[PDB]
């Protein structure tokens, strides 16, 4: 379970004392937690231009320690909410907040929020490192690879206010080589990172379908809405129409369909009839058919929920003498075959898919740094621990070990920090 305590002397981070005047719309913040008995109450969000945000002290993830001089450690959500609502308009509330506990991180990311976070100190330190004679890369890597992505957005903000220069511009000018690529990738938000990588994979008729496939096939609906949004903000065109430009045929069809990000959401009930029905349909459309009905495959694989499809592919083995991946490698070729194999891997076991892509990026002569870097950046706060345990199970040695063999210098150290562990 996450960390709890009823005693303020045992809380870790830093303490904030604020006074809010109750407005006609309350104090302007929502609270989360406090149903499970030993659960902190944390600030989930703030109403822009509302009393809490206008005051400027409260932040998301802050733990509510006490209200009006009464400790509420271990209060239920219902007891606390009642305290706030009883305060009449124009009266004020005193809030003691503990900063340093996380809200809503993935239990499977390798990279965690830094608990003693001081954006200003890091900005100062990275500036001092950038301006060292012969740049201090160690400090830059040491700091940025051990901050969460949203703490990096804060560092970038503080750096810009301290120097009047964007952080990412200052680091592009101070860094070089693969280290530059890692650090610049780390500085983007996930949606910005994926958008720019999608853009770079479509930089012309020389399209890198491998990279377009990796991102489009592996990102969830939520992730894709955000990507479609900031891609149009960043590049003043819709992601869909750049895909239509640089792709064609059934491959374009399947890429357009996935990139929309309107896959069915996880149902509450398992639909055994439709599972068998889909499994039958996939077989009818391929192995037992002359040629292959590609539209039926696109339809089923892009529209059903991921847990439903996991059971479809199992149930498909009842009908086909070849499983879904082996059937794909017999029925299609080229970019379309590649995309299908990538998608089915992501549905069946997304961490194993990334582990195999990481293994492929390093196993031979040299390194496919582009793939190695994008995976370590994009998955580090998502499922890197599952990726590592899948990789170690299959290949015997850790992911850490393979990175050590394939990379060197500060680049290697940055990738091992993103990896996590000491091995």
């Amino acid at each position: 379970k996450p960390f709890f305590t009823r005693n303020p002397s045992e809380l870790k981070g830093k303490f904030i004392h604020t006074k809010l005047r109750k407005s006609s719309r309350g104090f302007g913040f929502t609270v989360v937690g406090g149903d499970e008995p030993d659960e902190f109450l944390q600030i989930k969000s703030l109403v822009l231009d509302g009393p809490a945000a206008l005051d400027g002290k409260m932040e998301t993830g802050d733990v509510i320690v006490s209200v009006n001089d009464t400790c509420v450690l271990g209060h239920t959500h219902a007891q606390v909410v009642k305290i706030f609502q009883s305060i009449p308009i124009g009266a004020s509330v005193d809030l003691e907040l503990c900063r340093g506990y996380p809200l809503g991180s993935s239990a499977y990311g390798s990279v965690k929020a830094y608990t003693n976070f001081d954006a200003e100190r890091d900005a100062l330190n990275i500036e001092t490192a950038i301006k060292t004679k012969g740049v201090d890369e160690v400090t830059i890597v040491n700091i940025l690879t051990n901050r969460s992505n949203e703490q990096r957005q804060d560092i970038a903000f503080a750096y810009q206010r301290r120097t009047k220069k964007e952080l990412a511009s200052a680091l592009k000018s101070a860094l070089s080589g693969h280290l530059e690529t890692v650090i610049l990738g780390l500085l983007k938000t996930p949606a910005q990172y994926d958008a720019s990588e999608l853009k770079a994979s479509m930089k012309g008729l020389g399209t890198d379908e491998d990279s377009l496939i990796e991102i489009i096939c592996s990102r969830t609906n939520q992730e894709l809405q955000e990507i479609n949004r900031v891609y149009k903000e960043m590049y003043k065109t819709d992601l869909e129409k750049d895909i239509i430009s640089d792709t064609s045929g059934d491959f374009r069809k399947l890429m357009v369909a996935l990139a929309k990000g309107r896959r069915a959401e996880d149902g509450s009930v398992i639909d055994y009839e439709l599972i068998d029905q889909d499994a039958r349909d996939l077989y009818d459309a391929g192995v037992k058919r002359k040629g292959t009905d590609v539209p039926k495959w696109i339809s089923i694989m892009t529209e059903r929920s991921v847990p439903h499809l996991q059971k479809v592919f199992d149930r498909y083995k009842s009908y086909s003498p070849y499983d879904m991946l082996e059937s794909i490698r017999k029925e299609v070729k080229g970019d379309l075959e590649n995309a299908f194999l990538n998608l089915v891997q992501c549905i069946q076991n997304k961490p194993l898919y990334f582990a195999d892509r990481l293994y492929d990026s390093m196993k031979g002569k040299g390194t496919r740094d582009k793939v190695l870097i994008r995976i370590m950046v994009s998955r580090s706060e998502v499922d890197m621990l599952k990726i590592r345990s899948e990789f170690k199970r299959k290949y015997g040695k850790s992911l850490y070990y393979y990175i050590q063999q394939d990379t060197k210098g500060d680049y290697q150290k940055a990738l091992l920090y993103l990896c996590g562990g000491d091995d």
């Binding site: 309350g26 913040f29 929502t30 609270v31 989930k44 959500h77 909410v81 706030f84």
Partner: peptide, 6 residues
Amino acid sequence: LPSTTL
């Protein structure tokens, strides 16, 4: 799932 606007 515990959320409420205060």
